[PDB]
Each structure stands twice: as C-alpha cells, then as structure tokens.
Amino acid sequence: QPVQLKIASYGLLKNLTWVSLENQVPGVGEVKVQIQAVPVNFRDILNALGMLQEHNQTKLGITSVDHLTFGFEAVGVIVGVGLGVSQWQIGDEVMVIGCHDAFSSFIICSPNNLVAKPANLKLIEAATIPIPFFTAYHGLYNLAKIQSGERVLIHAASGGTGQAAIQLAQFWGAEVFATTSPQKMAVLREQGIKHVMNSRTTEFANEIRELTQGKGVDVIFNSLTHGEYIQKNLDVLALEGRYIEISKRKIWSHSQVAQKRSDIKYFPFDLLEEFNRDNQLYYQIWKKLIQCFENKELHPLVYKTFPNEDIVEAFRYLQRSKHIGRVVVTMP
Ligand SMILES: NC(=O)C1=CN([C@@H]2O[C@H](COP(=O)(O)OP(=O)(O)OC[C@H]3O[C@@H](n4cnc5c(N)ncnc54)[C@H](OP(=O)(O)O)[C@@H]3O)[C@@H](O)[C@H]2O)C=CC1
Numbered sequence: 001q002p003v004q005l006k007i008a009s010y011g012l013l014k015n016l017t018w019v020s021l022e023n024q025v026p027g028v029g030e031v032k033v034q035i036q037a038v039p040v041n042f043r044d045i046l047n048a049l050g051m052l053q054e055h056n057q058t059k060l061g062i063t064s065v066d067h068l069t070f071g072f073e074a075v076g077v078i079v080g081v082g083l084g085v086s087q088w089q090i091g092d093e094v095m096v097i098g099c100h101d102a103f104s105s106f107i108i109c110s111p112n113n114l115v116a117k118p119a120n121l122k123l124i125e126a127a128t129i130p131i132p133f134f135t136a137y138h139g140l141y142n143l144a145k146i147q148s149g150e151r152v153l154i155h156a157a158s159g160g161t162g163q164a165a166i167q168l169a170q171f172w173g174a175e176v177f178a179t180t181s182p183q184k185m186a187v188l189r190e191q192g193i194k195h196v197m198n199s200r201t202t203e204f205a206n207e208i209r210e211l212t213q214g215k216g217v218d219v220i221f222n223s224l225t226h227g228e229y230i231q232k233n234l235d236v237l238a239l240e241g242r243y244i245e246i247s248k249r250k251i252w253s254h255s256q257v258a259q260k261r262s263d264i265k266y267f268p269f270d271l272l273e274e275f276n277r278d279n280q281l282y283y284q285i286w287k288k289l290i291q292c293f294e295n296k297e298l299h300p301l302v303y304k305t306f307p308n309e310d311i312v313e314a315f316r317y318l319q320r321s322k323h324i325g326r327v328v329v330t331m332p
Pocket residue numbers: 041042043131132135156157158159160161162179180181184199200223224245246247248269270271272318321323325
C-alpha cells in the first residue's frame with residue numbers, strides 16, 4: 001500500500017511513522033514519480049526534532065506537525081505526466097531534487113525538479129548525487145569559481161556534501177585541505193587527501209597557516225558555525241578569499257563579514273532558495289555534471305542502505321553522524 005512518512009509530534013525520532021497516502025493525479029505542468037530510494041538529509045533530522053518550526057512557518061506554510069513531510073531528493077520512475085510537460089514520459093528513470101515529500105510512495109512535482117539518471121549507474125548509486133553534488137557544484141563553481149592550483153578547505157568532509165566537494169575539487173585540480181573526526185581520518189587520507197585535520201577542534205586554523213606560510217586558503221566550503229568556527233575560518237582565508245557558507249543556521253550577515261575582512265567574497269546560499277529564483281538551475285548544473293558521471297570521472301558517494309521498515313534507525317544513524325558519505329532508504 002502507498003505510504004507517507006509523518007510524525008505526530010516533534011522532538012523524538014521514535015515517532016516517525018508510515019501513514020496511509022492517498023492517490024494523487026498529476027495536473028497541468030506536473031509529473032507523478034514512483035519513489036524508489038531516498039537519502040536522509042541533515043535537515044530531515046532537524047525537522048524531526050522540531051528545530052526549524054519558524055523557518056517552516058515563515059518560508060513555507062507549515063503551521064503544525066501534521067503538515068510536515070520529509071525528503072528533499074530521491075530517485076525513481078515516472079508513472080504519470082500531466083499536460084504541458086514535453087520533456088518527460090512514463091518509464092523515464094529520474095533523480096528528484098528539491099521536493100519536500102520524497103519519503104512517500106509517490107510524489108507530484110514539477111518537471112523542473114527532475115533530471116535524467118545516468119544510465120550506467122544503479123538507482124541506489126544515483127541516489128547519492130543530487131543534493132551533495134548540486135550543492136558542491138553551485139558553491140564551488142557557480143559562486144566561488146574555483147580554479148586549478150587554488151587551495152580549498154572543506155569542513156566535515158566525511159558527510160554527503162563534503163564528500164561531493166572533495167570529488168569536485170580534486171577533479172578540478174584544486175589542492176584539498178580536509179577536516180573530519182578522528183575515527184574517520186584514515187578513510188579520508190585513503191581517499192586521496194594529503195591534508196586531513198580535525199573538524200571537531202578549532203586548531204585547524206593554526207595548522208593551515210603553517211602548511212601554507214601564512215597564505216591560508218583561497219576557498220572555504222563550510223557548514224560549521226558554532227563557537228568560534230566562523231572567525232577561525234576567516235583567519236585561514238587568503239586575501240580576496242571566497243567563503244561558501246551552506247549552514248543556513250545562525251550565520252553572519254554581509255556587513256558583519258565586511259567588518260572583519262573587506263577583501264573576501266561571502267557566499268551564503270540555500271540551494272532550494274536558488275531554484276526558487278531560477279527554476280532552470282537544476283537543469284543547468286546537471287548539464288555540466290552528467291558527462292563526468294558518464295565518463296566515470298565523478299563517482300557515486302560511499303553509502304549505507306536501510307530498508308524503509310527501519311526508517312527510525314536510518315535517521316538515528318545519520319544523527320550519530322559516524323557515517324562517511326550517504327545514508328539511503330529503499331522504498332517498498
Ligand atoms: N545550503 C544548502 O543548500 C544545503 C545545506 N546543507 C547543510 O550542510 C550541512 C552538511 O550537509 P550534509 O553533508 O548533507 O550532512 P551530513 O549529516 O552528511 O554531514 C554532517 C557532518 O558534520 C560533521 N559533524 C558532526 N558533528 C559535528 C560537530 N559537533 N562539529 C563539527 N563537525 C561535526 C560530521 O563529519 P565529521 O565526523 O567528519 O566531523 C558529519 O559527517 C548540513 O548542515 C545541511 O543542512 C546540505 C545540503 C544543501
């Protein structure tokens with residue numbers, strides 16, 4: 001039977017429940033997609049604990065917990081195409097990007113939220129691509145315009161977004177500086193990274209200064225904003241350096257960054273907010289990425305799989321944050 005992931009109250013992961021999902025028909029300009037695998041995102045956990053209640057009320061129409069759905073991306077198969085849509089047909093194997101209800105048996109979404117799956121990949125492999133690689137690409141290339149020979153710092157680089165940025169930075173000839181937790185350090189060293197440091201301490205700043213002779217890095221790809229992490233990031237940022245902030249939680253404003261370092265370009269961005277302004281964004285990024293995956297120059301991320309029945313433990317596993325890469329749920 002068709003189902004949707006819901007929570008009857010905020011604060012505890014235990015109450016994540018698959019509730020009956022009523023059939024929906026794709027109207028004009030709409031596509032119906034049969035969901036086959038869904039990664040758990042960091043923001044999914046935040047919502048489950050009820051930590052974006054204002055954000056969800058202001059920027060979206062979520063007034064109560066009963067209106068909350070889960071899932072920001074997926075892979076699946078087109079089962080219904082509404083009128084007006086010309087680029088899609090039933091049977092097309094697609095990745096979904098930027099929906100809010102991917103943890104459902106079926107979703108109705110725009111054809112602008114869909115890209116073609118690379119045919120040489122498995123469905124489950126392709127599920128590791130959308131948010132990580134589109135966020136990494138937009139931040140590093142679209143905004144920061146990183147070039148070869150440049151040095152880039154990627155924080156918490158064992159996660160989904162950090163792992164994609166690693167692949168992109170190296171393929172673009174940049175020199176990667178990574179930080180991760182101690183028990184993940186070997187794996188990242190073994191991924192092909194010369195400079196692996198601790199994401200859990202602020203002492204990375206001093207280490208970077210020494211490895212670079214005061215220069216620091218031209219680009220930071222950052223998602224850590226607690227304590228004195230932002231100030232420490234500014235210290236390691238070179239003259240004219242570029243600050244990609246993807247946190248979306250308690251970030252510095254443009255003048256606050258200008259107060260400290262006027263030379264640097266500050267790039268705070270929310271990917272789905274960027275699609276809101278330009279509905280072509282996913283299409284363009286993917287056009288610049290699909291050939292790399294086709295020619296096996298870029299690869300799916302490392303992932304662990306959970307069945308849908310164990311959704312709670314899939315969420316808990318991402319919450320404990322001991323993973324490298326992606327956590328992916330298969331659907332029934
Ligand atoms: N701006 C945008 O459009 C997007 C925003 N995001 C945001 O980016 C962030 C990362 O995304 P994603 O990679 O998918 O999430 P993940 O859960 O995969 O990554 C989180 C990583 O942070 C590190 N970490 C955990 N706890 C701490 C801590 N106390 N101090 C320092 N580091 C810690 C861990 O790595 P380690 O053990 O190596 O430290 C973990 O792997 C999230 O906040 C997410 O909401 C994500 C995608 C799109």
